[PDB]
């Protein structure tokens, strides 16, 4: 069901300052999905750094 590759992010979704349990991303950029949350964020990497980020701001693509 469930679909795995590349995530490309349409929305810009930055954690407030003390906010270091969420990633940074930003629109343009990409992000490889490696696992998905049941609560509906979905997990990737990004500059060596691993983290949860919003579903509906970033939209999954095909490589």
Sequence with gaps: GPFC????VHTDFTPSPYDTDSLKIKKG???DIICKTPMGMWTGMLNNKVGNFKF????VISE
């Design 56 to 59: 509906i701001y970033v939209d």
């Design 29 to 31: 950029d990409i992000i």
């Design 5 to 8: 590759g590349r995530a490309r």
